[PDB]
Structure 1
Amino acid sequence: HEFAELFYRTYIVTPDQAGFQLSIRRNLVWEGWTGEGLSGEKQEISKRNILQGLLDYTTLETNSTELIPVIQSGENDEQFIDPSVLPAQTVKQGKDTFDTNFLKFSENGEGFNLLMLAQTPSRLKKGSMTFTDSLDSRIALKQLLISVTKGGTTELFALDVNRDQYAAYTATREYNFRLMQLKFHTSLGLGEESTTVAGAESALLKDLFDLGYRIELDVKVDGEMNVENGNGDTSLRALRLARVFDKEGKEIALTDSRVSAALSGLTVTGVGYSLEARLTNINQLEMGLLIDSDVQKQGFMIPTLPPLVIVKPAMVEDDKTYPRLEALTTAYRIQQMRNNAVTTLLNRADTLKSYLGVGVPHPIESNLGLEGVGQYYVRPYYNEATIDVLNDLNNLTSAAKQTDIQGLIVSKINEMVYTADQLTGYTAALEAAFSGRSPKPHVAIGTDMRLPQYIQINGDDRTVGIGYDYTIARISDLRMKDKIVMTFILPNESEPHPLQHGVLGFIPEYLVDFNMIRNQRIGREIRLTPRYRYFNFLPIMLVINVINLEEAIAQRTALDVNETQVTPAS
């Protein structure tokens, strides 16, 4: 039969094993470990799988070399700005948690020491500020905080300055040997939608912004830094309103009455700055991201099934009490290969409803109560949808209606298959687990005796999808009536593998013929003991339900026109 072998590849086993056991290696990534300095935590922390990294974005982005300013109460509260203007921001690098704030401009004051200022809790245990800490080749400003004040109301603007004309420190032609200076001269524009820091649109410049106007702020800033001992100083030199523009980019004089009235009360000053530096150590004292592998191995075993037998009087031949020997074989083939497989499929559908919910993905190793070893190579995914063909089909003429319904259903199938390939990541799993070639995900379509002839007649918009292969499975059983079940199948493999949807656990059994004088009678009997089971791996499946199929064909449904509020009712 086609259906049972379509979803469950036959895997034959000799009668000398009680089952089969699988071994799979997983390669996983994780930062920092217990050790014995704290022996921290029972059952430790979680470890991530690397394959999840292909789909996620904070999985690999790590920074430990960054030299970000750090607050220490009562130590460096003088070098930072007064926190009464802006509260300290929290940042995380490595496993340290600490608060940061913008370094301030000083004119006549002493310079600071960036190298020392950025000591974080991880460093302190590892050793406080040794010789070989050397700043990287490039150091640049990232944000500048200017205070645009209108009538006593203060709005702070964290202007992103890392990306601009000139913010990269330049080596000097002379003076000392490592003195790198900052010679910063440009105008910073405040766009009509340039938001205030910490969200919220700029409520002060609205008057110019409502007219679509913009202001040009030129900035006059200089600085110097030493790249050997971490010392340097930076000072702001000038900052004022330079130019104002219109929507056409044409210079507008500041002497116009409207713009002058709008600019009355405008004073702009620079508060502080933040500076990016990376500690290029040649010896280095960081632990990167530790890489390991673990092995999860599973035990699968195969039992027997209840017996079947025919009894007949032991003196005669019969086609009455026993037709030939084929009857038991046919009954057994039904027993095995149809009802049990269909029941397994439906029970998996119910189970996936119970666990995964409707149409929601889960991360890798998100659940282990699910059966199947395939759970380590792909996000679990189960989704269902129904099509009310009576209320959804398009009708133009009475002649092409079957073509229209065929197109609708095939488009729905394409939608589900493509979105499954998008959300699961199965495609990359096929790309990786096999390397000899990149086969297209081979799709199988199983359903009852009803639907298939409404899927393939002629006029297929797209077969099941471009570059997609399909196999159509048909079965007469009732409880599969008026449904479509689809999944992902490998047609080129025979052995157990996490990318099979199912494997039919099969061991041969042979007829048992001999006399038993039991119950104090004599008769000939033929004992049949089937021993098989269905084992399924991949936790991915999609199902489609159809209703009102009869209703649409025998009753016209056309043109649900959507009047769009032209007859006055707002």
Structure 2
Amino acid sequence: HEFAELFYRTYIVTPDQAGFQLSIRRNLVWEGWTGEGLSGEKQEISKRNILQGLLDYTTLETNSTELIPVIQSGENDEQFIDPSVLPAQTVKQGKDTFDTNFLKFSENGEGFNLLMLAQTPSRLKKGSMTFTDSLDSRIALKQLLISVTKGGTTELFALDVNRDQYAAYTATREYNFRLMQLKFHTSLGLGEESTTVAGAESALLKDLFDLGYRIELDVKVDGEMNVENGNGDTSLRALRLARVFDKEGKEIALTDSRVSAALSGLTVTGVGYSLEARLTNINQLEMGLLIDSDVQKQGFMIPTLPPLVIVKPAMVEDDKTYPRLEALTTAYRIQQMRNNAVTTLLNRADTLKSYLGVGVPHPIESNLGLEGVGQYYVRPYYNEATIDVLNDLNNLTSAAKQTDIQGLIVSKINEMVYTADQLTGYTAALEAAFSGRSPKPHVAIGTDMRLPQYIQINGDDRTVGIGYDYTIARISDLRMKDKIVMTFILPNESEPHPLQHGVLGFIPEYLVDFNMIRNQRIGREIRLTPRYRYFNFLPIMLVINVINLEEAIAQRTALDVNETQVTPAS
């Protein structure tokens, strides 16, 4: 039957093997190893599939060569800004947790030796930092902390000074051959929407901001750095409010009453800075990211089933007391092809409801209880919706109700397919599974006898959207009362492939006919022993509930007119 065929393609099996065994490949990215401590514990192993990095950005992004200042209470505290101004922030590098903060500006003789100040525990366990270690050619200012004060209120500012025209250290030959210099003179602006580091719009500049004005800060800062031994220093040399502009794009002098009054009482002082520095590793002390692969294999077995019988006396061959064989074949075909398939599909739907909620996808290999091995390769996903036809219809003329309903259903279906494709990554899975073809995701559509008189469209182009294929199969079972089911299918593979919804293990069976003495009674019997089962692979399923379609076609429906508020109420 069509409905059974569409969701689970028949995969014939020669009747001498107990089932079919699947070998699926995988490629893994995973960092570090075992090797910690000294005990009898079993430890653990971390494994991340690379396809997670295809959607999320953190699986494949990691930094092991950054040099982040680390606070230690009582011996490296002086080089850091006062904790009272800004509390320490915790930043994680690899497996070490530590607190960091901006470096205090040097006055006249204070420095900082970045190599021996960025000692994280991971580097500590390896010994003293090797003299051969060198800093990368790129050194740059990451953030400047700038304090604006007026009357006693302090608001800290985190300006992203990185990626500015002169935030990058340059090569210079005046003193040494690997001494890097920073020469940073420009104007730093604070726009009319600029926010503080403490959240929300600033309040110390309300006067200028109300008139839409901005402020240019004259920032001119010099520093030097030696990438051979980490000796370097930085000292801010000026910060001053310089000009004022308006929203028309022209300068406004400070001699006017408004500008002078608004700028009065403002004091700006240098607070700190941060550095983007990567240790150019030459010693190879880094694991980076590893790429390994292992194999997973699953077993599937094909059972036997209770038999169907026909009885008659062994003097008898008729049509009524002995119905022809055709009836037996039809009963077999029905119980095989429709009832079991529908019930297993509904159980699959209920299980997917229970395990994954509604509308919330889980990552790759996030469950091991879900039947099937497609879960190893794509995100599991589930979603529900309800179409209230009495509420969702906007006609304009009673003679076009059919087209309106028809398009309403098609639009919801198309949107659902698009959302599933977006949240699942299914298209990327297809493009990875086969190279040389770019197969459009083929979508199955199944329902009872009622709806397929509305899913088609004759007058509007959209059926599943331009660029998707589809196939509708109608099933007579009453359990499918006004229900819509969708799944992703590829009708090009005749082998169990972990990217199709399901397979139907089929074993051909031939009837047996003999005389049998059943408890001292004599009679002729006919047997048919079926052998099959339905296996589910893909953990992606969509179900749509449609109700109240009956009333809308006959009940007066016209518009939900949004009288969008032009009469005094707001």
The TM tier, using the shorter chain, reads over 0.9
What is the deviation of 1:59? 1.5
How has the CA–CA distance of structure 1 residues 456 and 200 changed in structure 2, closer, same or farther, with 3 Å as cutoff? closer
Q: Which moved more, 1:29-38 or 1:194-203?
A: 29-38
C-alpha distance after superposition, 1:304-363 (max 9, x if no partner): 111111111111321111122222111111111111111111111122222211222111
Contact 2:407 2:457 (C-alpha < 8 Å) held by counterparts: no
Give the structure 1 partner of residue 299 of structure 2. 299
Contact 1:407 1:459 (C-alpha < 8 Å) held by counterparts: no
How has the CA–CA distance of structure 1 residues 153 and 45 changed in structure 2, closer, same or farther, with 3 Å as cutoff? farther
How has the CA–CA distance of structure 1 residues 43 and 474 changed in structure 2, closer, same or farther, with 3 Å as cutoff? farther
Contact 1:7 1:489 (C-alpha < 8 Å) held by counterparts: yes
What SS class does the counterpart of residue 52 from structure 1 fall into?
Answer: helix
Q: Which moved more, 1:554-563 or 1:413-422?
A: 554-563
What is the deviation of 1:37? 4.0
How has the CA–CA distance of structure 1 residues 320 and 469 changed in structure 2, closer, same or farther, with 3 Å as cutoff? same
Contact 2:213 2:247 (C-alpha < 8 Å) held by counterparts: yes
Contact 1:410 1:461 (C-alpha < 8 Å) held by counterparts: no
Q: Aligned residue pairs: how many?
A: 570
Tell me, in whole angstroms, the C-alpha distance in 1 between the residues paired with 2:551 and 2:7: 32
Tell me, in whole angstroms, the C-alpha distance in 1 between the residues paired with 2:409 and 2:506: 37
Contact 2:178 2:228 (C-alpha < 8 Å) held by counterparts: yes
How has the CA–CA distance of structure 1 residues 147 and 214 changed in structure 2, closer, same or farther, with 3 Å as cutoff? same
C-alpha distance after superposition, 1:149-207 (max 9, x if no partner): 11111111121111212121122242222222222211111112221113232111112
Tell me, in whole angstroms, the C-alpha distance in 1 between the residues paired with 2:569 and 2:256: 45
Contact 1:29 1:48 (C-alpha < 8 Å) held by counterparts: yes
Tell me, in whole angstroms, the C-alpha distance in 2 between the residues paired with 1:418 and 1:36: 47
Does residue 107 of structure 1 match 2:96? no
Does residue 569 of structure 1 match 2:569? yes
Q: Which moved more, 1:31-40 or 1:120-129?
A: 31-40
How has the CA–CA distance of structure 1 residues 39 and 181 changed in structure 2, closer, same or farther, with 3 Å as cutoff? farther
Tell me, in whole angstroms, the C-alpha distance in 2 between the residues paired with 1:38 and 1:101: 35
Contact 2:386 2:545 (C-alpha < 8 Å) held by counterparts: yes
What SS class does the counterpart of residue 479 from structure 1 fall into?
Answer: helix
What SS class does the counterpart of residue 553 from structure 1 fall into?
Answer: helix
Tell me, in whole angstroms, the C-alpha distance in 2 between the residues paired with 1:268 and 1:389: 63
What SS class does the counterpart of residue 541 from structure 1 fall into?
Answer: strand
Tell me, in whole angstroms, the C-alpha distance in 1 between the residues paired with 2:332 and 2:504: 15
Tell me, in whole angstroms, the C-alpha distance in 2 between the residues paired with 1:250 and 1:40: 74
Contact 1:406 1:460 (C-alpha < 8 Å) held by counterparts: no
Tell me, in whole angstroms, the C-alpha distance in 1 between the residues paired with 2:385 and 2:466: 22
Contact 1:189 1:217 (C-alpha < 8 Å) held by counterparts: yes
What is the deviation of 1:34? 1.6
What is the deviation of 1:516? 0.6
How has the CA–CA distance of structure 1 residues 41 and 245 changed in structure 2, closer, same or farther, with 3 Å as cutoff? farther
What SS class does the counterpart of residue 294 from structure 2 fall into?
Answer: strand
C-alpha distance after superposition, 1:196-226 (max 9, x if no partner): 1132321111121112121111012111111
Contact 2:378 2:425 (C-alpha < 8 Å) held by counterparts: yes
Tell me, in whole angstroms, the C-alpha distance in 1 between the residues paired with 2:254 and 2:150: 17
How has the CA–CA distance of structure 1 residues 288 and 457 changed in structure 2, closer, same or farther, with 3 Å as cutoff? closer
What is the deviation of 1:40? 9.9
What SS class does the counterpart of residue 99 from structure 1 fall into?
Answer: strand
Tell me, in whole angstroms, the C-alpha distance in 1 between the residues paired with 2:183 and 2:476: 82
Tell me, in whole angstroms, the C-alpha distance in 1 between the residues paired with 2:192 and 2:569: 36
What is the deviation of 1:38? 4.9
What is the deviation of 1:514? 0.6
Tell me, in whole angstroms, the C-alpha distance in 2 between the residues paired with 1:521 and 1:147: 105
What SS class does the counterpart of residue 293 from structure 2 fall into?
Answer: strand
How has the CA–CA distance of structure 1 residues 317 and 176 changed in structure 2, closer, same or farther, with 3 Å as cutoff? closer
Tell me, in whole angstroms, the C-alpha distance in 2 between the residues paired with 1:545 and 1:447: 11
What is the deviation of 1:238? 1.9
Contact 2:457 2:463 (C-alpha < 8 Å) held by counterparts: no
TM-score (norm 1): 0.97
C-alpha distance after superposition, 1:262-319 (max 9, x if no partner): 2222111101111111111222311102222232222211211111111111113211
* Percentage of identical aligned residues: 100
C-alpha distance after superposition, 1:108-134 (max 9, x if no partner): 214321222212111111221112111
Tell me, in whole angstroms, the C-alpha distance in 2 between the residues paired with 1:286 and 1:198: 36
Q: Which moved more, 1:323-332 or 1:304-313?
A: 323-332
Contact 1:410 1:460 (C-alpha < 8 Å) held by counterparts: no
How has the CA–CA distance of structure 1 residues 271 and 419 changed in structure 2, closer, same or farther, with 3 Å as cutoff? same
Contact 1:407 1:461 (C-alpha < 8 Å) held by counterparts: no
C-alpha distance after superposition, 1:33-92 (max 9, x if no partner): 222545697552542211111000111221111112112222211211222211112111
Tell me, in whole angstroms, the C-alpha distance in 2 between the residues paired with 1:43 and 1:294: 19
Contact 2:517 2:523 (C-alpha < 8 Å) held by counterparts: yes
How has the CA–CA distance of structure 1 residues 201 and 41 changed in structure 2, closer, same or farther, with 3 Å as cutoff? farther
Tell me, in whole angstroms, the C-alpha distance in 1 between the residues paired with 2:335 and 2:43: 47
How has the CA–CA distance of structure 1 residues 98 and 236 changed in structure 2, closer, same or farther, with 3 Å as cutoff? same
Contact 1:107 1:235 (C-alpha < 8 Å) held by counterparts: yes
Q: Which moved more, 1:172-181 or 1:521-530?
A: 172-181
Contact 2:499 2:537 (C-alpha < 8 Å) held by counterparts: yes
Q: Which moved more, 1:263-272 or 1:426-435?
A: 263-272
What SS class does the counterpart of residue 445 from structure 1 fall into?
Answer: strand
Contact 1:378 1:429 (C-alpha < 8 Å) held by counterparts: yes
Contact 2:133 2:283 (C-alpha < 8 Å) held by counterparts: no
Contact 2:49 2:364 (C-alpha < 8 Å) held by counterparts: yes
Contact 2:34 2:45 (C-alpha < 8 Å) held by counterparts: no
Give the structure 2 partner of residue 40 of structure 1. 40
Contact 1:141 1:276 (C-alpha < 8 Å) held by counterparts: yes
How has the CA–CA distance of structure 1 residues 508 and 542 changed in structure 2, closer, same or farther, with 3 Å as cutoff? same
How has the CA–CA distance of structure 1 residues 43 and 399 changed in structure 2, closer, same or farther, with 3 Å as cutoff? farther
How has the CA–CA distance of structure 1 residues 110 and 476 changed in structure 2, closer, same or farther, with 3 Å as cutoff? closer
Contact 2:225 2:233 (C-alpha < 8 Å) held by counterparts: yes
C-alpha distance after superposition, 1:400-459 (max 9, x if no partner): 211111111111110111111111111111110112311111111111111112122512
What is the deviation of 1:542? 0.9
What is the deviation of 1:463? 1.9
Runs of at least 5 residues in structure 2 that lack an aligned partner in the other structure: none
Q: Which moved more, 1:243-252 or 1:63-72?
A: 243-252
Tell me, in whole angstroms, the C-alpha distance in 1 between the residues paired with 2:416 and 2:554: 28
C-alpha distance after superposition, 1:240-272 (max 9, x if no partner): 221122222322222222222222221111011
Q: Which moved more, 1:302-311 or 1:104-113?
A: 104-113
Contact 2:34 2:43 (C-alpha < 8 Å) held by counterparts: no
Tell me, in whole angstroms, the C-alpha distance in 2 between the residues paired with 1:210 and 1:41: 65
What SS class does the counterpart of residue 509 from structure 2 fall into?
Answer: coil
Contact 1:170 1:180 (C-alpha < 8 Å) held by counterparts: yes
Tell me, in whole angstroms, the C-alpha distance in 2 between the residues paired with 1:313 and 1:78: 106
How has the CA–CA distance of structure 1 residues 110 and 392 changed in structure 2, closer, same or farther, with 3 Å as cutoff? closer
What SS class does the counterpart of residue 275 from structure 1 fall into?
Answer: strand
Tell me, in whole angstroms, the C-alpha distance in 1 between the residues paired with 2:485 and 2:354: 17
What SS class does the counterpart of residue 138 from structure 2 fall into?
Answer: coil
